[PDB]
Structures are given as structure tokens and as C-alpha cells.
Amino acid sequence: ITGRPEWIWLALGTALMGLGTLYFLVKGMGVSDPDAKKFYAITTLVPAIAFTMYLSMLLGYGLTMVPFGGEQNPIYWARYADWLFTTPLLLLDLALLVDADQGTILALVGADGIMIGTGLVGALTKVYSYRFVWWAISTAAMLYILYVLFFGFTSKAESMRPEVASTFKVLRNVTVVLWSAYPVVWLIGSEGAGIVPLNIETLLFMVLDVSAKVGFGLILLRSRAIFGEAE
Amino acid sequence: ITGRPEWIWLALGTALMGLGTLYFLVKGMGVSDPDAKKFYAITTLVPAIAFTMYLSMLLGYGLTMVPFGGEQNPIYWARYADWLFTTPLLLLDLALLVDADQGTILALVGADGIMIGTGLVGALTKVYSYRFVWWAISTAAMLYILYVLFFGFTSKAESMRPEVASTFKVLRNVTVVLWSAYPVVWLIGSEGAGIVPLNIETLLFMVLDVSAKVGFGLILLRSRAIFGEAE
Amino acid sequence: ITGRPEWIWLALGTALMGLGTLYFLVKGMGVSDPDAKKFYAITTLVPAIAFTMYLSMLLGYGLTMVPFGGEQNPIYWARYADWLFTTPLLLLDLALLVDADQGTILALVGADGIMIGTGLVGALTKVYSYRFVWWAISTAAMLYILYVLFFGFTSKAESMRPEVASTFKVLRNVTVVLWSAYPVVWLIGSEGAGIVPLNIETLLFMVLDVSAKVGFGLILLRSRAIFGEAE
Ligand SMILES: CCCCCCCC/C=C/CCCCCCCC(=O)OC[C@H](O)CO
Ligand SMILES: CCCCCCCC/C=C/CCCCCCCC(=O)OC[C@H](O)CO
Ligand SMILES: CCCCCCCC/C=C/CCCCCCCC(=O)OC[C@H](O)CO
Ligand SMILES: CCCCCCCC/C=C\CCCCCCCC(=O)OC[C@H](O)CO
Ligand SMILES: CCCCCCCC/C=C\CCCCCCCC(=O)OC[C@H](O)CO
Ligand SMILES: CCCCCCCC/C=C\CCCCCCCC(=O)OC[C@H](O)CO
Ligand SMILES: CCCCCCCC/C=C\CCCCCCCC(=O)OC[C@H](O)CO
Ligand SMILES: CCCCCCCC/C=C\CCCCCCCC(=O)OC[C@H](O)CO
Ligand SMILES: CCCCCCCC/C=C\CCCCCCCC(=O)OC[C@H](O)CO
Ligand SMILES: CCCCCCCC/C=C\CCCCCCCC(=O)OC[C@H](O)CO
Ligand SMILES: CCCCCCCC/C=C\CCCCCCCC(=O)OC[C@H](O)CO
Ligand SMILES: CCCCCCCC/C=C\CCCCCCCC(=O)OC[C@H](O)CO
Ligand SMILES: CCCCCCCC/C=C\CCCCCCCC(=O)OC[C@H](O)CO
Ligand SMILES: CCCCCCCC/C=C\CCCCCCCC(=O)OC[C@H](O)CO
Ligand SMILES: CCCCCCCC/C=C\CCCCCCCC(=O)OC[C@H](O)CO
Ligand SMILES: *C/C=C(C)/C=C/C=C(C)/C=C/C1=C(C)CCCC1(C)C
Ligand SMILES: *C/C=C(C)/C=C/C=C(C)/C=C/C1=C(C)CCCC1(C)C
Ligand SMILES: *C/C=C(C)/C=C/C=C(C)/C=C/C1=C(C)CCCC1(C)C
């Protein structure tokens, strides 16, 4: 495993997702409020699935070689199996916080599915120029998600409990900044133009993934907004 | 891409699914009624996922070669990844229109999963005679779905708002006729007996797919039945 | 098909899952109570998906060869495609019986996903020692599920209708005993240490699968607990 230079970042990612999972699991012990239980379940699942996929990349299972540009290129496909399930869970935490209507939840989850599925097709496409077609369609689906989070969700939170509104605004801003960096890393890294080497690309996705999953969860699960209003 | 004769129908399919997606997206702008939003989300997602899969077949990603009958046969597997998600969404539009109970929705979606999953196993099976075993099991699951749509759903719609009943009856009849043609095309085309060439088979599925997705959606989203009754 | 010694158990499994599906389908004819319909839909789907996967193993589609330990080893991967959908359906029957809160249902289904997904990664891993790492992570996710079924669910059932409590207690005990045997069979069989031959391993999983699906369903669907209380 140590033969690949990016191993150290996969190992550190594995450890941090593991530790984040155990922390949120212990913290959610004994919570009995039904609304809080939903947020603890969603939020604890997200680093638990990322732990399994980081471990699969560390041990070499989650890597394949894709020929493009006359080379055999190493593509970590397990990233997409993680993000297929973890990105809609993160969006569901936001939508539940603002009591989003069911049609908006379905639009967000379906656009997220299209973003990750087209990202995976782009990562495994053997004709170099067509990789960037799939990157553009996936980016258009991310822009729809970010538009709804600012022009659908923001206007509803501002009519709810003040602690729900302030917590949503922080997590919305966290999400828009961190998720917007992923298409840029892909475009400049090994899957795209090849300017940044795989070892630095792996470091960048590790910092983004721990921030967007464990950092986001620490903010949400310390908030009063996840409990029902009660005496 | 132009080396395959069926390319023109894949390109036309891509364009029509793309145009249908953009039309329904613009039309659903500003709709604020929660019931209408659910139907716009479901109905807009369906040509958006079909657009991505038609594009994957145009560019060659969604094609594999399966050896059977002593030949290498071209099988477009991306059709099944589209229909795995788009066929239950179309059934959910019908079920929501009639306020179907949750047990019936689960039976319809699960039978649909079995229909498409066994269709895919049949399309990729290398022993020729066994392809038709999977076709028969998939057809039996389609007959269950059509039985419920006529002997479960029809009897509930007739007790609801008149505009919900008339709109359901039209979309039910559209769905029964168009979906019944898919097993016949598969059986006579490249996946089955091989009587109709792949270029004509691709034309037939394009006409069916645009009719069952964009045609169905134009009927539903122009109806008063998708809005709640309000003053 | 008869060239593999385990064929007879795959054929018997196919038949029993087929017969169980047809029995539950006929029995659920005419049931009109909405709560009972949910349990019939969930419970009938489970042997129907297992029938398709047993048939795929009988015909040879659901088998692949994985090199580990210097051999090419036969791994029936279709077991995991069955259990990915059938194990959360069985857990949903239990959760609905006790009216479990939505956060607990999500935790159970997500832990179940992690159990089966890591089991599949373990079954297809080519480095022998790492197969047992994935077995341990999957077993830890099963222990979480069993903890919730005894220390979350048992305490809620005891506050509901007496027939719901007694039926849950029986099905909980059935589930804990039969599901705990699966990791032991995997560890001693072809996927693991290789002490028990594939033909006996296949017999063991057939007896467990029919008991945990058709046996469990016969107990549940004969119970008064699946109907709403009504005059
Ligand atoms: C939260 C507290 C922790 C804060 C931590 C945030 C750091 C995020 C990582 C960043 C990029 C740095 C990557 C290291 C740069 C190596 C690039 C390089 O030097 O390549 C040289 C090559 O030889 C010729 O260009
Ligand atoms: C809605 C308004 C639009 C209406 C449009 C509906 C048409 C649907 C397509 C049909 C089949 C026609 C396929 C073309 C037939 C070619 C078959 C053929 O001629 O093969 C000849 C071969 O050389 C010896 O058999
Ligand atoms: C519900 C009523 C039905 C009750 C049925 C429950 C049986 C479950 C199966 C069990 C294991 C028996 C497997 C047969 C044992 C064969 C092992 C063997 O003998 O291997 C010999 C080898 O030559 C040297 O060890
Ligand atoms: C080094 C440590 C390794 C890291 C751990 C390995 C992760 C894979 C194992 C298990 C799934 C465990 C459960 C995941 C679901 C927990 C959901 C939850 O917390 O639900 C709370 C809610 O309140 C309930 O009602
Ligand atoms: C593979 C990619 C897709 C699967 C990945 C899993 C991610 C979560 C799934 C779906 C959102 C579906 C809609 C669920 C929103 C319901 C929330 C709500 O509005 O409330 C309903 C509840 O009944 C009030 O108590
Ligand atoms: C309400 C639920 C909404 C659900 C929204 C989901 C939409 C998914 C969209 C797109 C891409 C699907 C791509 C399928 C990925 C297959 C890639 C693969 O595995 O290819 C293997 C091999 O290399 C080649 O044969
Ligand atoms: C709204 C927040 C989300 C927005 C996210 C989308 C932003 C995409 C931006 C830019 C593309 C810049 C293209 C630069 C690529 C040129 C690569 C190249 O070929 O140059 C070779 C290299 O630079 C020689 O050293
Ligand atoms: C040539 C044009 C190409 C075709 C376009 C590329 C398709 C892939 C891109 C994006 C997903 C965009 C969003 C799909 C989900 C829209 C859901 C919706 O409309 O929801 C309305 C509801 O009212 C809300 O609350
Ligand atoms: C991969 C194949 C499966 C996944 C493909 C995605 C297709 C849509 C999924 C599921 C239907 C599940 C049941 C949902 C029906 C609920 C509708 C209802 O009855 O109303 C509930 C709501 O709470 C009242 O406001
Ligand atoms: C409530 C939710 C209900 C959900 C109902 C879903 C039931 C799905 C049924 C069947 C077929 C599954 C077939 C699995 C397809 C794998 C095909 C494949 O990819 O094979 C690749 C390669 O060629 C070989 O190793
Ligand atoms: C209820 C609505 C849905 C019903 C959908 C199911 C209908 C299936 C019907 C028929 C099979 C006809 C079989 C014809 C195939 C014979 C092919 C053959 O071998 O003939 C060679 C060729 O004809 C020499 O030119
Ligand atoms: C030898 C016999 C072979 C075995 C049979 C082949 C299985 C694959 C075929 C079909 C799916 C049929 C329907 C599966 C879903 C049934 C759900 C149900 O029973 O729902 C009842 C509920 O009351 C409703 O409202
Ligand atoms: C691929 C692995 C995952 C997919 C496999 C399919 C298995 C079933 C799925 C999900 C449970 C999601 C939560 C559903 C629990 C809702 C039940 C409930 O509490 O009641 C709600 C209803 O609105 C009151 O009438
Ligand atoms: C609320 C919903 C909760 C959902 C919880 C789901 C968590 C799934 C976890 C893990 C493993 C995923 C493993 C992906 C399996 C891919 C195996 C494969 O097909 O590999 C093919 C080939 O051999 C190699 O390239
Ligand atoms: C709580 C209910 C669920 C608990 C489920 C987890 C139980 C796992 C137990 C034990 C491992 C025993 C290990 C024995 C394996 C040693 C194999 C070996 O190498 O021995 C060679 C062979 O015995 C020469 O004939
Ligand atoms: C837990 C990990 C998270 C929040 C990952 C987020 C990932 C995305 C927002 C990925 C976006 C992509 C594009 C928009 C285009 C090209 C490739 C992707 C998949 C990296
Ligand atoms: C959007 C596309 C739609 C509505 C596609 C519908 C597809 C089916 C009804 C497919 C049916 C099949 C059979 C019943 C048996 C054999 C093969 C299939 C998958 C073509
Ligand atoms: C219908 C079939 C059922 C109920 C199957 C249950 C399967 C499991 C509980 C499987 C468990 C596993 C482990 C806990 C670890 C290693 C391998 C598995 C997937 C066999």
C-alpha cells in the first residue's frame, strides 16, 4: 500500500472519518427527541460510509486504471460510490432543517444523483475530450443545487425559529464554498487536465471531505436547531 | 460516433430529451403550490436522466459487446440504467395523482425494479436460450404492474376530483399502450430473435421513449389535476 | 448447470422462493386494510427478489471467479445483490410493526447497507488477509443492528397492542438467531477460511435464506398484528 505516494493522505482520511463516526455515535447515545434522532442518524451515516470508501482506496480496491491520453491513468472510483450516498444525505440534513417541501427534496436529490453519476461517467471515459463534456453537465447540475439552496431554502428558513435560521445560514455557506471546490480540483487534477499531481489532488480532496462531513456535522450537532421546541 | 448507422436516432433522442427537460424546467419556474411542485420535480427529472443516458449511447460509453449465438453482439446497456430510475418515477406520478396507498406504491416500484433488473440480466446473458427465460420473468412483472394500474388505480381515481379522474384515465391508457410495446421490440430486435436490425430497433425505442416521457409529461403538466383545490 | 455439485441446492432454493412468492401473492389478494397491504407488499417482494437471484446462480450468471490464495475461487456475487434489497425490507417489516421513529429506521437501513456493501467488498478482495478486515467491519455493522432490535425496538413494542408486542418478540428472536449464522458460514466457507466446501456452504445458506424469508413471512402474515384495530 505504501508504494503509492498518496497513501499517507488516504490513511489520514480513513482515520479522521473513523474518529468522526465514533464521536457522533457516542454523542447521539441517549438522545430521545425524535427530530434530533433524525439528524444524528443522517449525520453519523455520512462519515461512516466515507470511512469504508477511504479504507477501500487505502487497500487498493477502490482504484482502477483508465486509458486516456496515451497513458494508463489511476482513477479512484470509490470516491463516487461514497459521494453517491453521502451528498444526498448532507442535502437531506439541510432540507429537514428548513422543513423543505417534498417536491424540492426530490429535485435536490435527483439533481445530486445526476451530478455524481455524470462525474463518474466522466472519470471513466476513454476519449479525452469527452471527459470535459461530462464535467460540464455535472457542473450544471451542481449550479442548480446551489441555486435552490440560496433562492429556495434561504427564503423559508427566514420564516422559522431564529436558531433554525442562523444554523441553516452557516451550514449553507459552508456547503456552497466547499462543494464548489470539488469541480475545480477534478478539472486541474488527474481526472482532468493533469496539472496537479495525484498526491496533491488526494490531499485536497481529503481536506475537503473531512471539512464537508465532520466539520459540517460538528456545527449541526452542537446546534439547538436540531431539537423540537419543548418545555 | 458516426460510424454506427443508429447514431442519427441516438442524436435525435438526445436532442429531444434535452429540449423536453429545458421546457419543463422553465414551465415549473414560479410554481408555488406544494402538490404541483412534486409533479414538476418528478416529471422534469425523467427526461433529464434520459438525456444523460442517450448522450452516453451517442458517445459510445453506454454500449458493450455480448457474445451469444456465435457472434459479438452490440448491447446498449445504458437503456437499463435510464429505465431503472425513470420507470418508477413515471409510476410515482400516476400513484400520486390517485393518492395511492403506500403499500400499493411499494408493490409497483418493487415490481418495476424486478422488470428492469431481469431485463438487464437477460440482455447480458451469454447462453442464447436463457435470454428468453429472463424476458418471460420481466414480462410477468410488467403484467402485474399493468393489472394494478387497471384494477387498483382506476377504481380509486373514479372516487376523486373529476379532473384527477379524467387525467389519470388518459395517462393510464397512454402508459399501457406504450409500455407494452417495449417487450415486443426487445424480443424481435438485437437483444432477442434478431429479426429487426439494430438501426431500426434504435429508432423504435427513440419514438417510444420520447412519447412515454416527454409526451406523457406534456399531458400531465398541462392538467389542472396537479394543483390542490383552492380558492 | 449440473456440472457444479451445489446445483441441487440452488435449484431447491429457486423452487422454494418461487412457491413462497406465489403463496404470499395469492394470500394478499383482496386484503383491503391499508396497514395490512404494506406488510403484504414488503413481505411478498422479499422472496420474489430472492427467486430471481437464486435463478441467476443456478444458470451461472451470478457466479464469478476471484483469485486469492493462489487459486481461482468461485464466488457467488448474486447473494449480495439479493441481500442489498431484501435485508432492509425485512428490517422495515420489523420497524413498521413497532411504529419505529424515522431516525431509527434510517439508522437501521444505513447500517444494513454498510453490512452488505462491506461483505461484497470482502468477497471480491484479492489480498487474502484483507478479506477478513471487511468481514470484521461488516460484523460490527450487524452487531449495531442487533443492538437496536433489542434495546431500541423491544422497549417500544412493550407499550403497544399486545398482539403487536408478542408477534414482534417472536420475529425479533427469529431474526437474531438466523442472521447471526451468516457471518459464521462466510468465515468458515469458500469466501473465508475454506474449511467447509462450497456445496455444503450453499446448502447452509439455502436453509438460512428460506427460513429468514419464507419462514419469517409465514409467521408475520398469519398474525393479527398486521391489521389496524377496527370494529
Ligand atoms: C484547518 C487547519 C489546517 C490548515 C491546512 C490547510 C492546507 C490545505 C492544503 C493545501 C495545498 C498545499 C499542498 C502542498 C504544496 C505542494 C506543491 C509543490 O510544492 O509542488 C512543488 C513541485 O516540486 C514544483 O511545483
Ligand atoms: C408523431 C408523428 C411522427 C410519426 C412517425 C411514426 C413512425 C414510427 C417509426 C416506425 C417504423 C418505420 C421504420 C422504417 C422502415 C425501414 C424497414 C425497411 O425498409 O427495411 C427494408 C429492408 O431493406 C428489407 O426489409
Ligand atoms: C426444518 C426440517 C429440516 C431439517 C434439516 C436441517 C439440516 C440443515 C443442514 C445441515 C448440515 C448437514 C450437511 C450434510 C453434512 C455433510 C458433511 C460431510 O459429511 O462431509 C464429509 C467429508 O467426506 C468428511 O468430512
Ligand atoms: C476505527 C472505527 C471505525 C469507524 C466505525 C466503522 C463504520 C462501519 C461500522 C458501522 C455502522 C454503525 C452505525 C452507523 C449508523 C449510526 C446511526 C445513528 O447514530 O443513529 C442515531 C439515531 O439516534 C438512532 O435512533
Ligand atoms: C442513489 C441516489 C439516491 C438514494 C440515496 C439516499 C439519499 C436519501 C434519499 C432521498 C430523498 C427522497 C425524499 C425524502 C424526503 C422526505 C422528508 C420530508 O419531507 O418529510 C417526510 C416525513 O414523512 C415527515 O415526517
Ligand atoms: C428520485 C431518484 C433520483 C435518482 C437519480 C439518479 C440519476 C443517475 C444519473 C446518471 C448516470 C448513471 C451512470 C451509470 C454508472 C455505470 C458505470 C459503470 O459501472 O460502468 C462499468 C463498466 O466500466 C462499463 O460497462
Ligand atoms: C460558482 C462556483 C463554482 C464554479 C466552478 C466552475 C469554475 C470553472 C472555472 C474555470 C476554468 C479555467 C480553465 C483553466 C484550464 C487550462 C488548462 C491548460 O490547458 O493549461 C495548461 C497549464 O496551465 C500549463 O502549465
Ligand atoms: C441541452 C440542454 C441539456 C439538458 C439539461 C441537462 C440535464 C442535466 C442537468 C441538470 C439537472 C437540472 C435539474 C433537474 C431537476 C429539476 C427538478 C424540478 O424541476 O423541480 C421543480 C420543483 O418545483 C422544485 O421545487
Ligand atoms: C432502484 C429502484 C428503486 C429506486 C428508484 C427511485 C424511484 C422512487 C422510489 C420509491 C417509492 C417508495 C415509496 C414512496 C411513496 C410515498 C408517497 C405517499 O404515499 O405519500 C407519502 C407522503 O408522506 C405524503 O405526504
Ligand atoms: C423497495 C425497493 C425494491 C427494489 C427492487 C430491486 C430488485 C432488483 C431485481 C433484480 C436483478 C438485479 C441484477 C443485478 C445487476 C448486476 C448486473 C451487472 O452489472 O453485471 C456486471 C458483470 O457483467 C457481471 O459480473
Ligand atoms: C398485454 C400486452 C403486452 C403483451 C406483450 C407480450 C406479447 C408477446 C407475443 C408474441 C410472441 C410471437 C413470437 C414470434 C417470434 C418467432 C421468431 C422466429 O423465430 O421466426 C423467425 C422469422 O420470423 C423468420 O423470418
Ligand atoms: C414459479 C413462479 C416464479 C415466482 C414468481 C416470479 C417473481 C418475479 C415476478 C414478479 C413480480 C410480481 C409482484 C411482486 C410484488 C407483489 C407485491 C404485493 O403482493 O402487494 C400486495 C399489496 O397488498 C398491494 O397493494
Ligand atoms: C440500497 C440500500 C437502500 C435501498 C433499499 C430499499 C429498502 C427500504 C428503504 C428505506 C428506509 C427509508 C425510510 C423509510 C421509513 C418510513 C416509515 C415511517 O416511519 O412512516 C412514514 C410514513 O409516512 C407514515 O405513514
Ligand atoms: C440512507 C441510504 C443509506 C445507504 C447506505 C449504503 C452504504 C454502502 C456502503 C458500502 C460499500 C459500497 C461498495 C460499492 C460496490 C462496488 C463493487 C463492484 O461492483 O466492483 C466491480 C469491479 O470488480 C471493480 O471495479
Ligand atoms: C453475537 C452473535 C454473532 C457473532 C458472530 C461472530 C462470531 C465469530 C466467532 C469466532 C471465530 C472462530 C475462529 C476459528 C477459525 C480458525 C480457522 C483455522 O485456521 O483453522 C484451520 C482448521 O480448523 C483446521 O482444520
Ligand atoms: C462528502 C463529499 C462531498 C460533499 C463531495 C462533493 C462533491 C461534489 C460537489 C462533486 C462535484 C463534481 C462536479 C460538479 C463536476 C465534476 C466532478 C465532480 C463529481 C467532482
Ligand atoms: C422511459 C422509458 C420507458 C417507459 C421504458 C419502459 C420499458 C419497459 C416497460 C421495458 C420492458 C421489458 C420487458 C417487459 C421484458 C424484456 C425487456 C424490457 C426491459 C424491454
Ligand atoms: C435473506 C437473507 C438474509 C436475511 C441474509 C442475511 C445476511 C447477513 C446478516 C449477512 C452478514 C454478513 C456479515 C455480518 C459479515 C460477512 C459477510 C455477510 C454479508 C455474510
What length is written for chain A? 231
Residue located via cell numbers 455493522: C141
Task: Return the C-alpha torsion angle C154, C158, C161, C164, nearest 10.
Answer: 30
Interior angle at CA B42, CA A165 and CA B141, nearest 5: 135
- Nearest ligand for residue C197 CA: 3
Q: How was this structure determined?
A: X-ray
| Complete DSSP assignment for B161-177 | -HHHHHHHHHHHHHHHH
Strand, coil or helix: A208: helix
How many whole angstroms separate alpha carbon A183 and alpha carbon A141? 11
- Helix residue ranges per DSSP H, A68-127: 78-97, 102-124
Beta partners for residue B74, in sequence order: B65
- C93 in Cβ contact with C43 (< 8 Å): yes
Residue B103 CB-half CA count within 13 A: 21
Look up residue C119 and give its three cell numbers: 461483505
Q: SS3 of A209, please?
A: helix
Residue range of the domain that includes A172: 1-231
**B146 contacts B180 by C-beta, under 8 angstroms:** yes
Provide the 10 A C-beta neighbour count for residue C30: 6
**Cβ atoms of residues B159 and B170 within 8 Å:** no
Copy the grid coordinates of residue C51.
427467486
DSSP label at residue B228: P
Helix (H) / strand (E) containing C47:
helix C34-58
Residue C106 beta carbon below 6 angstroms from any ligand 13 atom: yes
Residue that the C-alpha cell 469541480 belongs to: A183
| CA-based nearest distance C108→chain A, Å | 9
Which residue CA neighbors atom 16 of ligand 11 most closely? B193
The rounded Å distance from CA B109 to ligand 9 centre is 8
Query: Residues A55-64, buried b or exposed e (16+ Cβ, 10 A)?
Result: bbbbbbbbbe
In order of A16, A118, B72, B101, the CA distances from A105 in angstroms are: 29, 20, 43, 21
In C144-169, which positions are buried (b, 16+ CB within 10 angstroms) versus exposed (e)? bbeebbeebbeebbeeeeeebbebbe
The β-bridge relationship of strands A71-76 and C71-76 is: unpaired
What are φ and ψ of residue C74, in 5° steps?
-80, 120
Residues of A with CB under 8 A from a CB of B: 101-104, 106-107, 110, 113-114, 117-118, 121, 124-125, 127, 130, 133, 137
C-alpha torsion sign, points A130, A136, A139, A144: negative
- In chain A, what is the greatest distance between 2 CA atoms, to the nearest angstrom? 67
Query: Contact at 8 Å (CB) between B40 and A103?
Result: yes
Count helices and strands in chain C by DSSP H and E runs: 9, 2
Q: Are strands B71-76 and A71-76 parallel, antiparallel or unpaired?
A: unpaired
Task: Choose among B40, B60, B85: nearest Cβ to A103.
Answer: B40
Residue of B142, B141, B173 lying closest to B157 (CA atoms): B173
Resolution (A): 1.4
Instruction: Report residue C40 as a C-alpha cell.
Output: 403484504
The x, y and z cell numbers of residue C48, run together, are 420474489
- Say which DSSP state C76 is in: E
What secondary structure letter does DSSP report for A224? G
- Indicate the DSSP class of residue B211: I
Report d(CA B110, CA B145) in Å as an integer.
10
Q: What is the CATH number of the domain that holds A65?
A: 1.20.1070.10
Q: Do you know the residue count of chain C?
A: 231
Q: What is the DSSP string of A10-61?
A: HHHHHHHHHHHHHHHHHHTTT---HHHHHHHHHHHHHHHHHHHHHHHHHTTT
C-beta separation of B146 from B61 below 8 A: no
For residue A160, what are the CA distances in angstroms to A53, A129, A163, A165, A166?
37, 47, 8, 6, 10
**Residue C64 in contact with residue C123, Cβ under 8 Å?**
no
How far CA B203 is from CA of B13, B189, B198, in Å, comes to 9, 11, 9
In terms of C-beta density within 10 A (0-12 exposed, 13-18 middle, 19 or more buried), how is residue B27 classed? Answer: middle
State the Cα–Cα distance between residues B112 and C30, nearest whole angstrom: 21
Element (H, E) at A64: strand A63-68
The rounded distance, in Å, linking the Cα atoms of C115 and C87 is 10
Count Cα atoms within 13 angstroms, Cβ side, for B205: 31
CA distance A198 to A43: 29
DSSP E strands: which ranges in chain C?
63-68, 71-76
The cell for A105 is 427534496
- Residue whose Cα lies nearest atom 21 of ligand 7: it is A195
CB contact under 8 A, B110 and C48: yes
Furthest-apart CA pair in chain C: how many Å? 67
- Helix, strand, or coil (residue A193): coil
Determine the residue type at B182: Y
Q: Which helix (H) or strand (E) holds B66?
A: strand B63-68
Q: Are A99 and A35 in contact (CB under 8 A)?
A: no
Residue whose Cα lies nearest atom 2 of ligand 15: it is C180
User: At CA B216, angle to CA B229 and CA B177, rounded to 5?
Assistant: 120
- Bridge partners for C72 per DSSP: C67
Distance CA A224, CA A98 (A): 14
Burial class (CB in 10 A: 0-12, 13-18, 19+), C212: buried
Angstrom distance (rounded) from CA A190 to CA B227? 48
Cα separation, B86 vs B208, in Å, equals 13
Output the CA torsion sign for A52, A168, B35, B38. Answer: negative
d(CA C29, CA C43): 14
Contact partners of C by the rule of 3+ C-beta pairs under 8 A? Answer: A, B
Instruction: Say how far apart CA A152 and CA A160 lie, in whole Å.
Output: 14
| Residues after which chain C has a gap (C–N > 2.5 Å) | none
Q: At what angle do helices B102-124 and B128-148 cross, to 10 degrees?
A: 160
Provide the 3-class DSSP secondary structure of residue B64. Answer: strand
B209 lines ligand 17 (CB under 6 A): yes
Judge if the beta carbon of residue A93 lies within 6 A of ligand 16. Answer: no
β-strands A71-76, B63-68 pairing: unpaired
Ligand 1 residue neighbourhood (C-beta within 6 Å): A 200, 203, 207
Q: How many structural domains does chain C have?
A: 1
Residue with cell 455524481: A116
How far apart are alpha carbons B59 and B10 in whole angstroms? Answer: 9
Residue A65 CB burial class (10 angstroms; 0-12, 13-18, ≥19): exposed
Say how far apart CA A221 and CA A211 lie, in whole Å. 14
Within 8 A of C38 by CB-CB distance, chain B residues are 101-103, 106
What nine digits make up the cell of B50? 434520459
SS3 label, residue C123:
helix
Alpha helices in chain B (DSSP H): 7-27, 34-58, 78-97, 102-124, 128-148, 154-157, 162-188, 198-210, 216-221
**A230: closest CA of chain C, how far (Å):** 18
Fill in the DSSP letter of residue C64: E
CA distance A47 to A211: 11
Q: How far apart are CA C125 and CA C138, in angstroms?
A: 14
Q: Which residue's alpha carbon is nearest to atom 21 within ligand 4?
A: A41
Residues C138/C183, Cβ–Cβ less than 8 Å:
yes
